[PDB]
């Protein structure tokens, strides 16, 4: 009885959580953040590339 009273499991469970966090900290979030940053950079580069293609065509016809 007295289930609300904290037990020793408090310690053990915490340990496991840290383990998971470790992985999520080092092998889930950094790769995903890098992927998202690279995708946004790719989109911005696509926009800049379209603009520069328009500019270069305009210059070529001008010259």
């Amino acid at each position: 009885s007295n289930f609300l009273i904290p037990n020793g499991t408090f310690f053990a469970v915490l340990i496991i959580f840290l383990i998971v966090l470790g992985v999520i900290s080092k092998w889930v979030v950094p790769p995903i953040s890098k992927v998202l940053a690279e995708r946004e950079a790719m989109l911005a580069k696509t926009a800049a590339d379209n603009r520069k293609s328009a500019e270069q065509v305009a210059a070529a016809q001008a010259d």
Partner: protein
């Protein structure tokens, strides 16, 4: 004969007892989460079409990153982004693996669950809530100095309400834990209660409650993660 409590395969070590049932449930949750994480790490492509696991993980990351940016600059406190994310998935799994049909009769006419969500055990919620408590309080100490941070939290947004502010901080950890615990503890009774119904009638209320339990578990995981992020932001403002 509801038979509330009665943690299974309990074991004593170093003079302290441990609910083996909660340990096993947490271990299964950790194994599933680590399996998903490594599946992502071994099959994440920045160039080609993303996979389902990568899509889910990046959706979670985008949600948490956007929440942080809205609350406190993601540049200022990067370490919040992983933690909260972790928390979310953890809670989510701990509230969804229960859906699996792992309830039977323990040769006594009382329901027995092979797997029970660890959040139904007070130790799980207390561990997570206390860890988050220490985490954002230490972050606030680092941000505003060892002496400054306690002073700032005691003062609060207005000096003359200093006493209530103290209560507020004392309510931050407890409110984080008990809520979650209840949201799952109730389930542990509900399903068990429905076990008293005849088998030919048990299916329908069981199905309805378990579906709503899926939804509630998702909601509670999201709330826990978001509240952790919000408390971090409140603790990391000058």
């Amino acid at each position: 004969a509801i038979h509330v409590g009665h943690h299974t395969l309990v074991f004593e070590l170093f003079g302290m007892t441990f609910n083996g049932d909660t340990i096993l449930a947490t271990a299964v949750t950790a194994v599933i989460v680590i399996a998903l994480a490594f599946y992502l790490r071994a099959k994440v492509t920045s160039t080609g079409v993303p996979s389902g696991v990568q899509l889910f993980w990046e959706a979670l990351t985008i949600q948490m990153r956007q929440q942080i940016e809205g609350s406190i600059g993601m540049k200022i406190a990067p370490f919040v982004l992983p933690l909260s994310v972790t928390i979310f998935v953890f809670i989510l799994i701990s509230n969804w693996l229960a859906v699996l049909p792992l309830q039977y009769g323990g040769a006594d006419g009382a329901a027995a669950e092979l797997y029970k969500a660890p959040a139904s055990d007070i130790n799980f919620v207390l561990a997570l809530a206390l860890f988050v408590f220490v985490c954002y309080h230490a972050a606030g100490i680092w941000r505003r100095g060892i002496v400054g941070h306690p002073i700032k939290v005691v003062k609060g947004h207005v000096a003359f309400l200093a006493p209530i502010n103290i209560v507020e901080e004392l309510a931050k950890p407890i409110s984080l834990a008990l809520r979650l615990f209840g949201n799952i503890f109730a389930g542990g009774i509900l399903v068990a209660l429905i076990a008293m119904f005849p088998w030919y009638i048990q299916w329908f209320p069981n199905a309805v409650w378990k579906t709503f339990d899926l939804f509630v578990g998702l909601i509670q995981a999201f709330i826990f993660s978001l509240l952790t992020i919000l408390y971090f932001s409140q603790s990391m403002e000058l």
